[PDB]
C-alpha cells in the first residue's frame, strides 16, 4: 500500500518533468519549411504466386531480394528487379505471422503461431534450403523477428515479453519483461544496440539489448500499438495503432512530437515505415490503401491505393529506391 | 532473360511456379474447420477417428473422399483479437457445449456470443454440438435446471430442458446469412463425422448460392 503511493508520485514527477521540457511543438517550429507537394507513386512491379493472405515481408540488404510469408505455408524469395522466384521454402506450420531476412543474406528466420522461430540456411552446400535451428521457449504467438547478426536474433511474442536468442547454442540469452499485454511489433535501431517494442497495452518502451533494461517508456496511444519503426538517424520512432493514429516519439525528449491523424481515417494502422531521408512516413491501413505522411507537417502527401484487401506489411529498400507492399489478396506490389 | 545464366534463372522460376500451382490444387480438396468451446466439453474427442498428425493442434480425419482439417485454438491463453483473423477463411465453426456443467454454461454462452458476433466470423456458419445427453439426463433429476438458468419456467422434462438450452444459444445469432446446425451428442456416438459432413456440404451450397446470384 505504501509502495503504491510511491508508484503514483514517481509518475507525477515524470509527467511534470516531461511537461517542463516542452517549449514548442514540432508542427510549430517547422512551419516555415516548404511542403513536399504531392508524392505520386506508380506501381512498377506486381509479385504474384502466393495463394493465401500475406502476413509479413522483409527487404534484402542489397535492395534486390525480398522474402514473403503467407498462410499457404510457402516461403518465397523474390528477385525484385526481374520478378523471378529465387527460393521457395515449405514451412511446417501454415500459421506464420512474421518473417525476417538476415543482414548478410545467408539466413532467413520466419515464424508464427507455432510459438517457434524457425531459421533457414540459404547458402548450403547441398543446393537446398534446410532448417538450421528451431528456437523454442515462447508460450505465445511470435511476431517481428529481427536479425542482429548471423548468430543473434531478437523475437517478440504474446507473452508480454521479448527475447534475445543465440542461434548457435539455441538458448535464450536475454529476456525483456515489463509489458502488460501482447507485444505486436519491434524494430532494431541502426546502431544495433537498442530497440523499441510496441505492445497491446498502448505503450512502446525502449529496451537495451546488452543490459536488458527498459531505459524509457512512451505513452499516448488510445488503443493497441500494431507497428513501429525508427527514424533513420536512430533518435526517434513512429508507431501505428488501432486508434487510426500515428505518432512520433523522441528518445531524447521522452515525449511525442506530433500526431498523424486524419478525420477521414477510421481503421487502424497495420504497418509503419520511413523513407531514406526521414521525411515521408508510409503507413498501411485496414481500408486497403496506404497513405504517405509528411513526417514534419502531418500532411497527406499522396496515397498509394491499388490493393484489394488489407495491407499487412510495408517495406522500404535500404537505398530508398522503392517501396514494397503486401496485402491479404496474395499480391506484392513495388512502388516508386 | 538475354544472358545464358539469366535464361536458366527464368527456367528455375517457371519450375518453381509449377510446383506452387500444383500444391494449391492439392490444397483445395480439404475443409478447414475451427474447434471452439469451454474446457472439458469434448472439444478434443468429437470423432473417434482422430489421426491427429502447446499451441495450435490440427486434426486431419477424412470422410467420403473429403479431407476435414480441425484446428483447436485452445491453450494459446492470449488475446483472441490478434490471431483469430488467421481463421477468417474457415468453412465453419464447431462449438462444443457440455450440458452436465451448470457452472461453465454461462461461460460457454459468453464464448458463443463473442465468436458469433465477431466481425471476421459474421458469415461463417456454426456447427453447435451439445454433448453428454445421458449425463445431463441423470443430472436434471437430482438438481433441476434452475440454479444455472433462473428464468426457466417450462416443465422439468428432458425434452423441454434440452431444447431450452438450445434456444439460448441460437438467441445470440442476431445475424443473417448465418445458420446454426445443432445436434445432440453423447459419449458413445460414432456418427459425429457423418453429422459434420452433411452440415459442411449444406454450408457450401449456401455460399455457392450467394456466389451464383440465385439468392
Amino acid at each position, epitope marked *: 500500500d505504501q509502495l503504491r503511493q510511491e508508484a503514483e508520485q514517481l509518475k507525477n514527477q515524470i509527467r511534470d518533468a516531461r511537461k517542463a521540457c516542452a517549449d514548442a511543438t514540432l508542427s510549430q517550429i517547422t512551419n516555415n519549411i516548404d511542403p513536399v507537394g504531392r508524392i505520386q507513386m506508380r506501381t512498377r512491379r506486381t509479385l504474384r504466386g502466393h495463394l493465401a493472405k500475406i502476413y509479413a515481408m522483409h527487404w534484402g540488404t542489397d535492395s*534486390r*531480394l525480398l522474402v514473403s510469408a503467407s498462410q499457404d505455408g510457402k516461403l518465397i524469395i523474390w*528477385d525484385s528487379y526481374t520478378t*523471378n522466384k*529465387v*527460393h521457395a521454402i515449405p514451412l511446417r506450420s501454415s500459421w506464420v505471422m512474421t518473417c525476417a531476412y538476415a543482414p548478410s*543474406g545467408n539466413y532467413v528466420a520466419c515464424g508464427g503461431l507455432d510459438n517457434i522461430c524457425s531459421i533457414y540456411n540459404l*547458402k548450403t*552446400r*547441398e*543446393g*537446398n534450403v534446410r532448417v538450421s535451428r528451431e528456437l523454442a521457449g515462447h508460450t505465445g504467438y511470435l511476431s517481428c523477428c529481427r536479425f542482429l547478426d548471423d548468430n543473434q536474433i531478437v523475437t517478440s511474442s504474446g507473452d508480454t515479453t521479448c527475447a534475445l536468442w543465440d542461434i548457435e547454442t539455441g538458448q535464450q540469452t536475454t529476456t525483456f519483461t515489463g509489458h502488460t499485454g501482447d507485444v505486436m511489433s519491434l524494430s532494431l535501431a541502426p546502431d544495433t544496440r537498442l530497440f523499441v517494442s510496441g505492445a497491446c497495452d498502448a505503450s512502446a518502451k525502449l529496451w537495451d539489448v546488452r543490459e536488458g533494461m527498459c531505459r524509457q517508456t512512451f505513452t499516448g496511444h488510445e488503443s493497441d500499438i500494431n507497428a513501429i519503426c525508427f527514424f533513420p538517424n536512430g533518435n526517434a520512432f513512429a508507431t501505428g495503432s488501432d486508434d487510426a493514429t500515428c505518432r512520433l516519439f523522441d528518445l531524447r525528449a521522452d515525449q511525442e512530437l506530433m500526431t498523424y491523424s486524419h478525420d477521414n481515417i477510421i481503421c487502424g494502422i497495420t504497418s509503419v515505415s520511413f523513407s531514406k531521408s526521414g521525411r515521408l512516413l508510409l503507413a498501411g491501413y485496414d481500408d486497403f490503401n496506404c497513405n504517405v505522411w509528411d513526417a514534419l507537417k502531418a500532411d497527406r502527401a499522396g496515397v498509394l491505393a491499388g490493393h484489394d484487401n488489407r495491407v499487412s506489411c510495408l517495406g522500404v529498400t535500404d537505398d530508398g529506391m522503392a517501396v514494397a507492399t503486401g496485402s491479404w489478396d496474395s499480391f506484392l506490389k513495388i512502388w516508386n | 532473360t*538475354l*544472358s*545464358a*545464366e*539469366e*535464361r*536458366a*534463372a527464368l*527456367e*528455375r522460376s517457371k*519450375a518453381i511456379e509449377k510446383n506452387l500451382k500444383e500444391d494449391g490444387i492439392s490444397a483445395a480438396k480439404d475443409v478447414k474447420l475451427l474447434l471452439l468451446g469451454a474446457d472439458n466439453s469434448g472439444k478434443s474427442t468429437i470423432v473417434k477417428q482422430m489421426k491427429i498428425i502447446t499451441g495450435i493442434v490440427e486434426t486431419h480425419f477424412t470422410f467420403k473422399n473429403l479431407h476435414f482439417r480441425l484446428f483447436d485454438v485452445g491453450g494459446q491463453r492470449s488475446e483472441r483479437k490478434k490471431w483469430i483473423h488467421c481463421f477468417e477463411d474457415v468453412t465453419a465453426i464447431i462449438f462444443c457445449v457440455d450440458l452436465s456443467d451448470y457452472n461453465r454454461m454461462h461461460e460457454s454462452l459468453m464464448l458463443f456470443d463473442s465468436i458469433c458476433n465477431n466481425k471476421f466470423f459474421i458469415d461463417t456458419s456454426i456447427i453447435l454440438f451439445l454433448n453428454k445427453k445421458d449425463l445431463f439426463g441423470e443430472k436434471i433429476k437430482k438438481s433441476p435446471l434452475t440454479i444455472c438458468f433462473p428464468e426457466y419456467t417450462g416443465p422439468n422434462t428432458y425434452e423441454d430442458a434440452a431444447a431450452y438450452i438450445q434456444a439460448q444459444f441460437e438467441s445470440k445469432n442476431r445475424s443473417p446469412n448465418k445458420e446454426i446446425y445443432c445436434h445432440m451428442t453423447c459419449a458413445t456416438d460414432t456418427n459425429n463425422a457423418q453429422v459434420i459432413f452433411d452440415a459442411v456440404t449444406d454450408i457450401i451450397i449456401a455460399n455457392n448460392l450467394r456466389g451464383c446470384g440465385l439468392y
Partner: single-chain antibody
Amino acid sequence: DVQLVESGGGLVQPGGSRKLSCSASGFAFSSFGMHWVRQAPEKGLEWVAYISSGSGTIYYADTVKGRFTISRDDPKNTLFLQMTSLRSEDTAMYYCVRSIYYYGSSPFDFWGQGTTLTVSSSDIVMTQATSSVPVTPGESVSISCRSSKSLLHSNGNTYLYWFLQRPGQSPQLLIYRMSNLASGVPDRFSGSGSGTAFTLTISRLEAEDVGVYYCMQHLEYPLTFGAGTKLEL
C-alpha cells in the same frame, strides 16, 4: 559430402558406342544442371554438353552436335552420356560438373573425378597470353586472358570463370563472375577485368597454388575455355 563419380571409361574401337554414367550422392541432384567437360591429353579442357534442371533445356557442342546425347535420371541420381560414333578425337578425361542458376549462385563450384576414355587408331575465342610461368613462393603472380566479344552484359555482370587444375586432380572454381571468390578458396586470390581484358592475381603465393589455370566464359553457349596457363616452381 558432395561426391560425383563417373564410370564407363575404357578402350573402344572407332565406330562403336559407349555410355558414361555420373552418379551423384550428397546434394539435391534434381535441382542442379549438369555439364560434361572433357580434357584431351596435355591439351586442355573443352565443354561438351549441358542439360538443364528437369531435362528442359539441352545443348551440345558444335564438334559433337548430333553425335552425342545426354539423359537425366533424377529419381536415380545418375547422369548419362551416350556417344554414338567415336573418332580418335573423342579420347579425353570426361568430367561431370554440377551447376545451379539463380541470382548470386555459383554454377561451377564442384567438378567430378573424371573418367578416362581411350579410342584406338562465330564462337567467343578466349586466348591466354602465356603457357608457363616460373615463380618462387611469396611473389605475386598475375594471369591474364582476353576474349573476342565483351563479356560485360548490359545487366552489369561479367561472365568469366577462373579454374585451377592441380596436378593429378580435377579443376576447382576460384572466381566465377569477375571478382567473386568461390566457397572455401583462400582469400589471397583476386580477380578483375574490363570488358575484354581480365587479370587474375595471386598475392602471397603458396606451394599448393601450382597448377594449370583456365579462364572460361559463360556469356553464350557453347562454352569456351582458355589455352591454359601453367605455374612452375
